[PDB]
Amino acid sequence: NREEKILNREIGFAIGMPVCEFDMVKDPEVQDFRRNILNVCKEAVDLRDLNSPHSRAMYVYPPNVESSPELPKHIYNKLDKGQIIVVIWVIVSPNNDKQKYTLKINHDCVPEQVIAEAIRKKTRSMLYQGKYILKVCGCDEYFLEKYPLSQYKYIRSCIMLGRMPNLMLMAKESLYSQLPMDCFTMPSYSRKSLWVINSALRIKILCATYVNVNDKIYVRTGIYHGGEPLCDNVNTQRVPCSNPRWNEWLNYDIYIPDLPRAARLCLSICSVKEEHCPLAWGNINLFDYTDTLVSGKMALNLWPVPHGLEDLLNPIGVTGSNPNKETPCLELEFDWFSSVVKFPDMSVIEEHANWSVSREAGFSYSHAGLSNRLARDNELRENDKEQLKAISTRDPLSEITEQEKDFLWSHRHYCVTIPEILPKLLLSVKWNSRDEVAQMYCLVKDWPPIKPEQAMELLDCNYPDPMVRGFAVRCLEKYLTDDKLSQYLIQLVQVLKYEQYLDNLLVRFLLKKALTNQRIGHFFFWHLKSEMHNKTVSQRFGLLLESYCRACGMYLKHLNRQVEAMEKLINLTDILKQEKKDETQKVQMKFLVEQMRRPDFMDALQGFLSPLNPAHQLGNLRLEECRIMSSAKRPLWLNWENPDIMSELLFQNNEIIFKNGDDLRQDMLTLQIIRIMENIWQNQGLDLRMLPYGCLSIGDCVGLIEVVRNSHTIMQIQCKGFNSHTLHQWLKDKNKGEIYDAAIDLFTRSCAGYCVATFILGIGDRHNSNIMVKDDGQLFHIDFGHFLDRVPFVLTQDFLIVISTKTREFERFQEMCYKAYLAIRQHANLFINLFSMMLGSGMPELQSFDDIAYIRKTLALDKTEQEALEYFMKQMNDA
Ligand SMILES: COc1ccc(-c2cc3c(C)nc(N)nc3n([C@H]3CC[C@H](OCCO)CC3)c2=O)cn1
Asked: Where's the C2 PI3K-type domain?
């Protein structure tokens, strides 16, 4: 139609490839995902059309609230008798006069209540009903829901900062006048035997093509469930280099009905010299998306080995053929049985599980042989019930012995009483034994829900089973707040890579939330779009992006304006670091200024939302405040006017650093971990102010960085002014009076926060230029080069003098680092889980579980609470 043709050009621009291309794809799964996902779209749109227009407003401007309405002790204490002084603004008459009405009201007042007092003060300022809404002055953040005022992140941040909230009052009708009439349309594309196989698995390696020049070669194979072999790996015969025809059947120690649902064939072409090397790799799901077992002739196009691969295989790697067909192509053959073999229905598995529990009970009783895996009733002693608990308290990095596994499995029915043990019991299963797997399925089917922070662990590369991942999704669906879903969004987008198929419970969950919360949808779009360059995820992420863009609504027009901006800056910074690299900042700036005269450039680089915070409107480009930086990759310091009616009450200008050349993924993760550490310390009552500024990767070593206003590096404070006493005097000068005592306190609390953080994460070398200080004393670190692969933030005499060595303030400071280290140690399981989910991300500083182990060392998990306290105590004295 007319609208369908306009939509597809808009979707195409957003993804970076035309939609017609997805149709010219003959994979039934691709076309099934495309059609079968459409109900997740339908449900999301329906929820937005439910309480229209209010429900459409909640979509476009979701309330930005904290997870709990409860405030910590140190936060509540800042309120003058549990009450907050709030400032409500009104835009009066035709001359748009800003008029403030100050209040002092209960921090837990709902926005409809706050409005009432503001109308009461307006009616009294001389001596209406609820057709109004509250907005943050200077940004598009609204207060459309009945939450305690202190629950909104702006209000809580204000309390924390000792800043007075500035909110603007406006008509509900004036906001709804900005929400357009969106319509969802149905696209043009929308309109056996089971365990009866009494046989062992064999796979024929026929031949290899596109394998030529540059001693011998072979095909290394293995059958895997996650990253664990379901039997021993089987190699083909060694063969001369250019001639690769094996025509060999490989015979595996697995009986076909014993194959788990998420069983994979993991293969690689290896070179020999004593020194075996993988040339290419590829993995195949033994069952297709429809539960059908792979049969017959097949050809798999192979992938290049990832930089820094362990063994000769890549089990954690992507499944399916490499799209580039000019690559090593391996031709295989699978046994064809009586008909089309299909994995049994849940009911057949349910009956076999009941049969297995029965045969298990009458097995021994009447066996004669010994079994450490048979379940025994009444034989569970209180000293071993307390030993089972000690297992559940173990970190995800800790090794679980074969004895502990047999122990855990014989107690599989008790385990249901310690629900947080499940990841360990799931590892304890003999995943190559249909008998135990059918039984495990029924346990999960009725397993007590676990916390989302625990659920997430069952979504890394170790838990491939659809039932295990389905239960994890179910725990998130019911217990994960939007605040928290937003906080862990980069790991949830990352673990999508561990999914066997396009259509799954996780993608369905993530997409429903994306299409019912625009703040989630923004970052869901950007985290997906930023990996379109990566061919390993291009199709899955592209299809996910198509389904998103097809139902997001008018936000696509906003996303496309953002895409056009980043594309211009990439083009711009390409020319500077290529051609005009050694040219002066005046000539380089003359080129930018000449390019800004161009219409396509002055439309693109102005009047669009900030990808770091879509609540921020980037108006006119103030070139006069922009500069090409001195850094090697020629990054841009960019300055935009804040076109908000009340910009002045937040920030009149918005500064973003656009960088093209370096990987921002490692900074993205370090800044996320900081936000988390900060939120852990804050929840535990100890106020250690951190600054996880915005950093977003938009592609292949391209991204944006939030500039922190009123900040200078440690070097800049030393330089303009060898010198070791300048910092304190500068902070005394920038905070003279009673204002000084607050600044010294904000420097120590922030200085303590970064001391712990950097130590734990093993962050890159911290110097005078890698550290920064705000006008109020707030200390923060920047450019986190590389983590894990020592105390990097060495407290020099410079920082020590600002603290007040044998002082009362330094005795308070040490007590700040100590509680903080204990606070992170009590949460090490979460941090371990966040890094594990990122293994799939191609990050060099995080390629194996060995890398994550660094935080088991620095957080002394194998030691005790007092022992680890002694570890941090000892490591902090060595400077
Ligand atoms: C991963 O890549 C990167 C690249 C840049 C930054 C980066 C962040 C930053 C922030 C958040 N806030 C403020 N205020 N400044 C900042 N800077 C400035 C440092 C001083 C410099 O001054 C000129 C040379 O001395 C101007 C730039 C940065 O570089 C961080 N990570």
From this structure: 197-344
